[PDB]
Design a protein around this nucleic acid. Structure first.
Ligand SMILES: [Mn+2]
Length: 212
RNA sequence: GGAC
């Protein structure tokens, strides 16, 4: 299963320090605008140590699901979340298309996940009924790891030993497909977030993805 | 400090 996950992982260094510093400033400006109430309601998802910023297409998850279950996550109504920022197209998405990571016109969803030290996201599969593959992630502000096949326990939070631990370094691009994207959860453990880390996740929603 |  660890070997199976490996076949679906593409990881490469793509962004330089100056490019990360420019984007990390754009991330800091996204956080500032969200704190000023200048984004649409569903653009900003707030949790104690993690903030999610949905552009282009957002999704419901977790406790926002009244009926929890496989296939229950939903996209928001059309045109609800804010459009992908121009700086995301030029700085992040044009670099990925020019380096053949994804086709042009693939990405219609750009989500920025912002983690404070000790933050996490519990094990999950990116909803197969919502998102097409592959899943592209670009990390910022610090180095961390992406873990697979972890079982979470709570009160207090405990995370089982990962099937695979993948270091995700600042400026590196992580791509998930196949088994690593479909047949096993991925997560972030609190111990792996030692400083603030942000990741811009570029995805393609399916033509049949249900909306709220 | 909680997406399976
Ligand atoms: Mn995910």
């Amino acid at each position: 299963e660890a070997r199976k996950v490996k076949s679906g992982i593409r990881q490469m260094r793509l962004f330089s320090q100056d490019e990360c510093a420019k984007i990390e400033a754009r991330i800091d400006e996204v956080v500032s605008r969200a704190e000023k109430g200048l984004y649409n309601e569903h653009t900003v998802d707030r949790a104690p140590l993690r903030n999610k910023y949905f552009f282009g297409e957002g999704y419901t998850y977790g406790a926002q699901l009244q009926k929890r279950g496989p296939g229950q996550e939903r996209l928001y109504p059309p045109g609800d979340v804010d459009e992908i920022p121009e700086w995301v197209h030029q700085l992040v998405i044009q670099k990925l298309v020019e380096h053949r990571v994804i086709p042009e016109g693939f990405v219609n969803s750009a989500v920025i996940n912002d983690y404070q030290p000790g933050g996490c996201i519990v094990s999950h599969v990116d909803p197969i009924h919502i998102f097409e593959r592959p899943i592209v992630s670009v990390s910022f502000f610090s180095d961390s790891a992406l873990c697979f096949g972890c079982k979470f326990q709570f009160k207090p939070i405990r995370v089982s030993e990962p099937v695979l631990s993948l270091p995700v370094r600042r400026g590196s691009v992580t791509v998930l497909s196949g088994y690593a994207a479909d047949e096993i959860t991925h997560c972030i453990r609190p111990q792996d977030i030692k400083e603030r880390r942000a990741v811009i996740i570029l995805r393609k929603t399916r033509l049949d993805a249900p909306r709220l």
